[PDB]
């Protein structure tokens, strides 16, 4: 121990944390894109079924 | 008696725009491009054919109105009626509510945590935290105090000195000052007090 | 009234424009990086230091559960699907000669505008999904990127306006 | 030019008011320069109302409190508190 | 008849996910019984 | 209905008195220094020692990024903005004892007033700003400070309400 090289029992950095990051959120931008989809295919049906 | 000097903090120089710190640029970027794609869309579906002006209140105005506010949970004052635009509506209120709580979150963790801080103090705590390094004039009394003594936390302090490298020591006081100096903290040197408190 | 379809044309010849310079270029990010430890930029495709004596020195980008995610950033085929999605809006704003009185093409159009538009914003966050995998900063291709999916939404709504302008106006 | 809205003084003073707060008011500005300012003054509210309560949860974890004197010299710049010696003994001389 | 209150099935289905995430949503039970769902959930 | 051609002028005449009083005088602030430590007092420009055997002496104040912030608290720039824009607005209103009928002097004078108020309230932010980088308190031209303010914009909606009494009563 009294010759190592590490902090052998205590190392806490504790940082100012990294800030919140985009690849903590991305999962709701990817769930939105896709309800804009399936607003699309619904929007191309709605008024227009009936046309004839 | 032998006492301790360290370089002296400075204060604070907060930053005129630090609000957005708590949220990296790439979200603030994200946003305008989801509103804007956001806002498009639900023009587009509310504007085909009515087959008449009356059938949907919602022209491109009202439209990034009604998203604008959307987003800044102030309420609006035209819902969509369209399945085609509810859907849209509530899908981007989620969006909105994880994006606020997320955010507030982030900013009451920051706080804490830039206030637990409890800086190095009384001399003694500096046994915990060696990353600050320490030293003393070479070849001096100093050392042979601290070689000669016997008690836990000198001889903790002498052993680490004794293993610790590179070499802490320094040939002179005026090396050892410009040493603390240059190293800009993260470097404390050790010296008696009636030299320490005329340095200042 | 009326004149904008001048504008139509001169929106979907600017996004075309600059879409195929912003997939066509090598400056997308700037980085420290190898080309076998200097500061470099790379692009899509491929990388390329410089800051030195080596200036030009670059080789082929390797981008080798997350592996499906890593396997659609190395297809990359989101931008240039915006690209072909755009070229079949000119295919259909190109519909001056036939089916006049119609326009059901020229509402078409708009729908192509708004899924390029799409297009770019998926490949956006995929693309910083990826490099979050450095003191970095953004080339102007990136810019151009961006700006290309601006003037997308920007003609499509006036596409359809004029739609309605020469529909819509014809109900009475 | 426009005389159809009721943006009466103090009903404008009452938009602003239920603004500030989350309670959604009824009337809009249904204009274009009035959205402008309806648009900031959100997100002004918005920023305002989050950084305190991040600060009030903060504040109440730490509860860190020292200081009344200290200083060992500023126990002169003040007269609210007493201060004193045993009387007749050599730290009396001494002052 | 009765006919205080408009709600149909899809409507009330907005009506809930809409007070669900607070966006103020335009209509309001307007009768008895009704207000005793607007204000628990 | 009548009277309120007289009202407003008064009134912006003593926020105008109110406010150049405010920039000239010594006691925006209290706090301890030195004139060559003592209780001490400053206004916008100058320091001046009291309670003391240099009572009465004062001296210059150091004003040399924050260094372009630092500029604009030294050249004030925004409260003489406020004081000369409310000084043409009373001059507005006083040039509309004449030539009446136009109604539009009116309407200038309002958006004088009002432009006056936004230019104190970024002074105002900008002063306290630069100090906050003791014991500290306000002194009472930080009051005139906001009663200039406080005022204006009452005046204004006046002014605003002065113009649409007297203007197109002839059609409604």
């Known amino acids: 121990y009294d010759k190592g090289e590490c902090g052998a029992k205590d190392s806490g950095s504790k940082e100012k944390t990294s800030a919140l990051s985009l690849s903590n959120v991305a999962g709701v931008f990817y769930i939105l894109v896709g309800g804009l989809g399936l607003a699309m295919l619904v929007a191309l049906i709605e008024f227009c079924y009936k046309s004839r | 008696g032998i006492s301790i000097m360290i370089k002296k903090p400075q204060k604070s120089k907060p930053g005129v725009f630090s609000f957005l710190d ?143 490298e590179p070499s802490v020591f320094v040939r002179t006081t005026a090396e050892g000052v410009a040493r603390v100096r240059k190293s800009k903290g993260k470097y404390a040197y050790l010296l008696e007090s009636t030299m320490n408190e005329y340095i200042e | 009234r009326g004149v904008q379809m001048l504008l139509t044309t001169v929106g979907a010849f600017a996004a075309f424009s600059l879409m195929t310079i912003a997939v066509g270029t090598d400056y997308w990010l700037y980085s420290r990086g190898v080309c076998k430890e200097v500061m470099t930029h790379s692009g899509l495709w491929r990388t390329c230091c410089l800051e030195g004596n080596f200036k030009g020195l670059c080789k082929q980008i390797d981008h080798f559960a997350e592996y499906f995610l890593r396997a659609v950033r190395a297809s990359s085929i989101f931008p240039i699907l915006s690209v072909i999605l755009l070229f079949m809006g000119g295919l259909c704003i190109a519909a001056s000669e036939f089916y006049k009185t119609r326009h059901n093409i020229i509402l078409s ?64």
């Not at chain 3, 999904?129 to 999916?149: C, E, I, R, V």
């Open chain 3, 109 to 172: 159009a708009g729908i192509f505008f708004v899924s390029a538009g799409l297009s770019n914003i998926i490949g956006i966050i995929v693309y910083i999904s990826a490099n979050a995998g450095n003191s970095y900063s953004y080339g102007w291709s990136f810019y151009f990127g961006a700006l290309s999916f601006i003037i997308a939404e920007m003609v499509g709504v006036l596409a359809v306006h004029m739609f309605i302008d020469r529909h819509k106006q014809l109900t009475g």
């Open chain 2, 22 to 164: 708590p949220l990296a640029y790439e979200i603030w970027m994200c946003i305008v491009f989801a509103y804007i794609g956001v806002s498009v869309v639900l023009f587009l579906v509310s504007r085909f054919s009515p087959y008449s002006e009356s059938t949907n209140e919602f022209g491109i105005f009202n439209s990034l109105w009604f998203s604008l506010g959307a987003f800044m949970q102030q309420g609006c004052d035209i819902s969509p009626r369209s399945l085609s635009g509810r859907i849209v509506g509530g899908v981007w209120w989620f969006f909105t509510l994880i994006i606020i709580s997320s955010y507030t979150a982030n900013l009451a963790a920051f706080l804490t945590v830039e206030r637990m801080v409890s800086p190095i103090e009384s001399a003694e705590d500096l046994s915990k935290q060696t990353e600050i390094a320490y030293g003393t004039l070479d070849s001096g009394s100093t050392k042979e105090f601290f070689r000669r003594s016997k008690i836990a936390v000198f001889d903790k302090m002498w052993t680490y000195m004794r293993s610790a």
